[PDB]
């Protein structure tokens, strides 16, 4: 450390970290920015927070820290604390937790020709507005906006870093040697863009920032297995009410009302997961509400069928138009001996009246059966068509084929 | 730069950040204060706290931080740590779960004329009273009172930068829409310091909730259950399923009232209209259960148990159908034993048929009551559903 | 005062607060540690963490901070900022939240002979291994281990802090005037021991708290509802099969018990070294109600045995109609011309049909009586099984008592 201590004295015996490394005021300090993504920790939908683990490579030049390898016995590079050197105060503007700077203040590497390089890590919790229309088969655009906290475009300039071939790296870099795939989200694109705007006052100092846009796609196997398929099956169970008999002990309304109840349980389940925003309804939300309405209409229909089937003849006269509709729909799918004789005649008349009563009851039951038959096909067509139409929107929601390279 | 280093050495040679930066102690420091709302992070209704991301721009002039640029290589501006200089002690009066004053000390832009601009960021968690009267179609006006804590108006004067807070860099919220925003200056006399007034600027924001989420997740299921309530009366008594439907609807409504109780603060200033609708639906279903118990009890009255009152036969058999449409309800010991047996058969069947007719009359009464109650209950459901919501709905649509 | 200022200047001339006060090499600094429990904030069983508010009582000697009071206008005691003097590095070793240090930095009281007394406050969250077996009728033994983080035994030797009563007092001090007892826990014992190392750790002072839970909340909110639901489950067997409500009562009792189990999981610990006795009781009750459902299905099956289709086995008749009714006190109520020619045929026939109906109804009544006998047998069996199980579990819970000796 004799040479390293010599170099430290030679550099920092006279040095002011408060000041930009510029000979004149109207120079600009060009700073090469790169961002490496170690991990995409999470995307809290409820809080609308993308949590990511990143390394922030910032390179620039400081003429005050220039030196030669020969004069110091071979010291090619020197690690100093980051508080001893001037820094560009790069902050994540779109942070949600209030943390602007990096969490850990790593050392800065000072090289021979005054080149300064700083690669601190960071856990960043950025704001990401979640578009929910196609949840769980959705994709998101989460931006990370970096800017100097104090300096403007005429003092601190941003450029992207260049690879060995000289090509500009306009994207979030990913080191396979330091990347871990997220189990829920696949990154498809990650372009980067340097934006420059005019100042608040016309002709004043403008502003600049670097925005990295992560296009991320959800892997919906978990929600398909655990939320969608059970909901579809328990919803389809509502149609079985049509085959139960329309009489006491049939439990026709019990199945329908409890299926509705379970459908509301599933509503609460999706409510736990989706955000609370009101810009749009989630796809699972529309599917659930459609299926609840279908089940409610089937509860109504079961009530109507039970009403029609249990019309006794003594109170409800026979509707001829209903029977006509039924026939339409069928092809598509001695005084003491005198006392004894009067008694026997009364027996006969009573039994004939009872038989006619039973006949009219059977007719009403057949009407209920025919109505249930028709409405089963009606409800089945409605349920299947609505399920297909809702889920086809999820099927066609693919990530756009943007004019960018893959993010890998 | 070397000139800038020399300048910074010169300015802070005998500088005192405790002293108010004016030429004379008898004059006040003029501070321009502006608020820039970057994001409305959260509106916690239960805790009644609004969390916002803001930039608190403060501009003033320091008398002792002026220089001639010609003497320092033409440097017309520098960036200085804010901890080294005097600052106004702006405090958020209505702080709830946050910091009273700024804690993140960014740098200050200092001009050669002494003009300091300082734009620190902050996460303000302020107390925001929740008017729950129209929830979820509710509008919340709440505010951020900001003022110098220890400096009265005679030593430090704060002025609003503009009437409205700056919403140019505002991230649009997915749950709230800011309709109005305004900053008002106030001269307040406090009991602690009667002699002198203290200045404050209250920045108020009026936010209208976007109710689609609560419409989809709460209102529509409740409407479906309230509609399902009325269908019990069209369900016959012979199916043995009126009670199951009624009690199932009531249990679902218990669940829903107990989840909406958790989405509202427990204050007693007012009762929400969604709560009013839930209790209307509660009493609605409970009355349905009581009256359906009466109907079911009426369905099984027989001559064995009860006789028909005259008024029941006057009303429900003849009066009501005026509106309805229905059916308006060598002798030997063994030989003589057989004859008397046939007599007994005749009398037994005649009496049984008469009692069956009486039971059918009672069933008819329960039937006509069921249709009357179906009409009344469906109309009451529609009337209540419109009455609770239509006021706020048409008020917002006309607004 | 000016004399105090001069004394402070004299004492802190060439004084290093980072240097342990050892006059000679190899000297030990004896530190007396005591604890005063201001409040037992909580014992969170989910995190297995005891939160407490305490006042430490640290006493040692610094030979460098002694003076003659007569030479300093009779000043014999000073209150000096704790950062200005050497402190033992005493920390809560078994903290759970990673916080080792005291809550507030206050004055150390320094006597003229060099005696240092420091009584900092501390809000601590220590680790406690929860014995879940007898929850909520359990007692926990939660420890607070205080030790020097850096200095070993040869440098700093610890000992228990004696109260003004002396006698080497080994106990946590609680001021009964201002101490407010926790609403959930009662402090049975509160000793204090010096654990010295074997022959590698170092000396530590452990303050133990034996705390007994007050189970009134769980008795009112959980145990009594379970008893009532279990009583209903018993009473399912007295319900007739003709009412058609056995399945409803039994399965909805099971649903209520499941609701209680799920909404009790908020409160119980989540370790896996044992099962709480309340969870054992809930599992036993759930299994009993499941068997009640099973046997109610069996009884309903027996009751509806179609006579023409099923012939009763002779052994079934002997057991369930002749033998067991005697023991169960269920005594059956019964101790056990052309026109005229064809009219005669019809009358004899009607008698024949009525006789056949007698035969079938007699067989049906025999089947229903067997069902009733089986129902009464299961009623008595379930009463016995419920009473014995509940008594055993309740006696196991009630006879679990806290130890009379802190250190068996």
């Amino acid at each position: 450390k004799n040479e390293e201590l010599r170099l430290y004295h030679y550099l920092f015996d006279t040095y002011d970290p408060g000041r930009r490394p510029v000979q004149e005021p109207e120079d600009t300090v060009t700073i090469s920015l790169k961002v490496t993504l170690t991990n995409l920790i999470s995307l809290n939908e409820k809080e609308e927070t993308l949590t990511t683990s990143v390394w922030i490579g910032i390179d620039w030049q400081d003429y005050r820290l220039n030196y030669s390898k020969g004069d110091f016995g071979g010291v090619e590079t020197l690690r100093v604390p980051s508080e001893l050197v001037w820094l560009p105060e790069i902050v994540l503007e779109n942070n949600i937790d209030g943390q602007f700077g990096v969490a850990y203040e790593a050392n800065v590497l000072v090289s021979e020709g005054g080149y300064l390089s700083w690669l601190p890590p960071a856990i960043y919790r950025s704001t990401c507005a979640v578009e929910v229309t196609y949840f769980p088969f959705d994709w998101q655009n989460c931006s990370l906006v970096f800017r100097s906290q104090t300096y403007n475009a005429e003092e601190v300039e941003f450029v992207f870093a260049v690879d060995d071939e000289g090509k500009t790296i306009s994207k979030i870099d990913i080191d396979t040697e330091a990347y871990t795939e997220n189990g829920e989200w696949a990154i498809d694109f990650c372009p980067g863009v340097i934006r420059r705007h005019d100042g608040d006052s016309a002709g004043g100092p403008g502003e600049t920032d670097v925005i990295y846009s992560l296009i991320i796609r959800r892997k919906p196997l978990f929600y398909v297995i655990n939320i969608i398929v059970p909901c579809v099956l328990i919803s389809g169970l509502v149609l079985l009410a049509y085959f139960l008999p329309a009489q006491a002990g049939g439990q026709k309304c019990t199945v329908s009302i409890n299926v509705l109840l379970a459908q509301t349980v599933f509503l609460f389940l999706i409510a736990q997961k989706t955000p609370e925003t009101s810009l749009s309804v989630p796809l699972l939300g529309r599917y659930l509400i459609f299926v609840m309405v279908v089940a409610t209409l089937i509860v109504m229909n079961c009530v109507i069928v039970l009403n029609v089937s249990l019309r006794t003849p003594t109170t409800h006269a026979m509707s001829p138009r209903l029977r006509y509709v039924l026939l339409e729909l069928l092809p598509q799918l001695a005084p003491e001996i005198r006392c004894c004789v009067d008694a026997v005649n009364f027996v006969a008349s009573s039994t004939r009246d009872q038989e006619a009563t039973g006949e009219e009851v059977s007719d009403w039951v057949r009407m209920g059966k025919a109505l249930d038959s028709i409405c089963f096909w009606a409800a089945l067509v409605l349920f299947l068509v609505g399920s297909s139409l809702i889920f086809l929107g999820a099927y066609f929601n693919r990530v756009p084929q943007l004019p960018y390279p893959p993010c890998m | 730069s070397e000139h800038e280093t020399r300048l910074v050495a010169k300015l802070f040679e005998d500088y005192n950040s405790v002293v108010r930066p004016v030429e004379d102690h008898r004059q006040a420091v003029e501070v321009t204060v502006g608020l820039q709302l970057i994001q409305l992070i959260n509106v916690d209704e239960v805790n009644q706290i609004v969390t916002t991301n803001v930039r608190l721009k403060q501009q003033w002039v320091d008398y002792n931080l002026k220089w001639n640029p010609d003497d320092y290589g033409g440097v017309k501006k520098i960036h200085i740590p804010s901890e080294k200089i005097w600052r106004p002690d702006l405090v958020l009066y209505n702080n709830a779960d946050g910091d009273f004053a700024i804690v993140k000390f960014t740098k200050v832009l200092l001009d050669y004329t002494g003009h300091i601009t300082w734009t620190p960021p902050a996460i303000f968690k302020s107390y925001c009273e929740i008017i729950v009267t129209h929830f979820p179609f509710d509008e919340q006006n709440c505010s951020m009172k900001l003022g110098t804590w220890t400096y009265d108006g005679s030593v430090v004067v704060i002025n609003p930068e503009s009437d409205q807070p700056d919403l140019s860099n505002f991230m649009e919220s997915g749950e709230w829409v800011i309709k109005e925003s305004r900053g008002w200056k106030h001269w307040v006399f406090y009991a602690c310091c009667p002699s002198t007034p203290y200045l404050d600027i209250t920045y108020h924001f009026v936010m209208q909730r976007l109710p689609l989420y609560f419409i989809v997740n709460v209102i529509i299921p409740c409407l479906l259950f309230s509609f399902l309530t009325g269908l019990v009366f069209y369900l016959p008594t012979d199916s043995g399923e009126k009670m199951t439907l009624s009690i199932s609807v009531l249990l679902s409504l218990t669940v829903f009232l107990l989840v909406i109780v958790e989405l509202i603060p427990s204050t007693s200033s007012a009762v929400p209209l969604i709560g009013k609708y839930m209790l209307f639906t509660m009493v609605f279903v409970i009355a349905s259960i009581i009256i359906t118990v009466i109907v079911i009890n009426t369905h099984h009255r027989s001559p064995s148990t009860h006789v028909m009152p005259e008024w029941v036969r006057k009303v429900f058999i003849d009066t009501i159908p005026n509106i309805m449409f229905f059916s308006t309800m060598i002798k030997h010991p063994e030989v003589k034993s057989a004859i008397e047996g046939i007599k007994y058969i005749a009398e037994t069947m005649k009496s049984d048929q008469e009692s069956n007719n009486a039971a059918e009359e009672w069933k008819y009464v329960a039937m006509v009551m069921d249709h009357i109650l179906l009409a009344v209950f469906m109309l009451v459901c529609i009337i209540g559903t419109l009455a609770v919501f239509a006021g706020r709905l048409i008020e917002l649509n006309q607004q | 005062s000016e004399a105090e200022g001069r004394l402070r200047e004299k004492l802190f001339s060439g004084y290093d607060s980072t240097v342990r006060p050892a006059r000679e090499v190899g000297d030990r600094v004896w530190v007396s540690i005591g604890l005063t429990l201001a409040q037992l904030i909580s014992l969170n069983e989910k995190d297995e963490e005891m939160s407490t508010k305490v006042y430490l009582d640290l006493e040692w000697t610094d030979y460098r901070l002694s003076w003659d009071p007569e030479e300093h206008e009779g000043i014999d005691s000073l209150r000096i900022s704790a950062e200005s003097v050497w402190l033992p590095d005493v920390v809560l070793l078994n903290n759970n939240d990673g916080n080792f240090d005291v809550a507030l930095d206050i004055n150390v009281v320094v006597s003229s002979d060099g005696s240092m007394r420091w009584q900092p406050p501390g809000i601590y969250r220590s680790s406690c291994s929860i014995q879940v077996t007898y929850f909520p009728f359990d007692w926990q033994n939660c420890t607070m281990v205080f030790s020097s983080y850096s200095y070993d035994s040869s440098e700093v030797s610890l000992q228990t802090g004696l109260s003004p009563e002396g006698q080497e007092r080994q106990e946590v001090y609680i001021h009964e005037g201002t101490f407010i007892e926790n609403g959930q826990w009662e402090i049975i014992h509160k000793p204090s021991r010096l654990i010295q190392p074997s022959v590698g750790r170092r000396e530590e002072v452990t303050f133990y708290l034996i705390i007994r839970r007050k189970p009134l909340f769980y008795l009112v909110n959980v145990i009594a509802p379970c008893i009532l639901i279990t009583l209903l489950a018993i009473f399912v067997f007295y319900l007739p099969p003709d009412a058609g409500e056995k399945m409803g009562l039994s399965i909805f009792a099971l649903l209520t018990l499941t609701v209680f189990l799920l909404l009790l999981a908020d409160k119980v610990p989540e370790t896996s070294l044992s099962v709480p006795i309340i969870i054992k009781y809930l599992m036993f009750t759930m299994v009993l109600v499941t068997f009640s459902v099973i046997l109610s299905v069996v009884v309903l099956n027996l009751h509806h045995r179609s006579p023409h289709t099923h012939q009763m086995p002779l052994w079934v008749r002997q057991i369930f109609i002749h033998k067991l009714p005697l023991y169960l006190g269920l005594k059956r109520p019964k101790p056990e011309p052309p026109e005229l020619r064809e009219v005669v045929s019809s009358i004899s026939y009607i008698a024949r049909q009525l006789q056949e109906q007698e035969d079938h109804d007699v067989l049906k009544e025999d089947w229903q009586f067997v069902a009733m006998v089986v129902d009464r047998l299961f009623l008595w069996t379930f009463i016995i099984f419920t009473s014995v199980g509940t008594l055993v579990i309740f006696l196991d819970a009630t006879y679990h008592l806290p130890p009379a000796d802190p250190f068996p």
């Binding site: - | - | 909110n221 319900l239 009412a243 009562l249 005669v344 009525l354």
Partner: protein, 427 residues
Amino acid sequence: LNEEERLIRHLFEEKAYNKELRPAAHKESVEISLALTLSNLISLKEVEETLTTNVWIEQGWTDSRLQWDAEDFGNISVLRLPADMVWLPEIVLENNNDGSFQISYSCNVLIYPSGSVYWLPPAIFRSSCPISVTYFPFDWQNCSLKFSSLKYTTKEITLSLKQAEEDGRSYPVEWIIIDPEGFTENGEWEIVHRPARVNVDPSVPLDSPNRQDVTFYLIIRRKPLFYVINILVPCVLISFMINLVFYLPADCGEKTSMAISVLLAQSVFLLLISKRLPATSMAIPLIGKFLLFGMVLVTMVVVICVIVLNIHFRTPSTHVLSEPVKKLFLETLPEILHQELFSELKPAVDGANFIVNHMKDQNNYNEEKDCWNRVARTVDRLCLFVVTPIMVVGTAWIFLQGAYNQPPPQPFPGDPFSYLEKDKRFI
């Protein structure tokens, strides 16, 4: 130059101020005057037993080292200084449960030419407030904020209440100050009493910093409209629906199902109201007592419904309807509550006799069934008249105990002083 700069140079550099030394002689105590202004009662969390309050704590004392003659400094009569530049008594909240002893924002101190140091920092304090649950939601709580110095004892400082003046007469401020210009009413809690006391404990030794303290008490009554309207009314109506099962018939009416459904609703209410209160064993909540009573009543009603259904479905082939029960349940209780040819026709006569006997036996069977049904209905009516009064009296008693609970007329029992501003006690 500025007179403030000259005055600061005079006080802190010329005179060499030392903030580590008290502004008093060695055997003398500094008099600290304390007051509290409640800006906002943020919350009272019952499960955590924590009172969160926004308070401005007003401290005042005299520092003879910080006195100056205004005439020598351009008639300057006030100076704002950082709090860290001067000696402070370091008053902290002793009752905190989150570990935040100190004030939130360490604002400036105002010093005057007489040497009076005046400090008014704000703070958000989270103090421990043990909760009495016996009358929830009709309960009132008694929280306290205890302020003392852990750095100094009674020998070093002397805590006291702020003294105000009215028409030249001095009196101590023995209450929490409520500035109308800086106070916000809580929507759930109303302040009934807000006294302030200086407590000295003779039990603890004189060298203990905990000997002296200043306690500001808040006796607060809950506004129960929210809980009454949202929790109590639905639960009470659902509980009182249990009386309807007695009116249900014993054949189609699912009496047992309705009763156990009421039980399930009560259980849901109990388990979802238990979470809103702590698990203390001091007492059972009023709503909890009512729910337990209602659940026991519903259990008894379920047993009664089972027994009634058992009686209703009895038969001659299963049970014998004895005369005493018959008279008791059908007469007394309902009253108080409200040759060759002969050989060929021998088959005819035999068949007729057999048919007649069959029909007679069936008629007797049906009559016994009807009698059993009537006995069941009588038992149902009797159980209604027995159970509904017991259900209506218990509910009324419990909720009258809840409603008639109110805070004491005085803040401290045994102390006649009202601790009101109108009753200020001049010295």
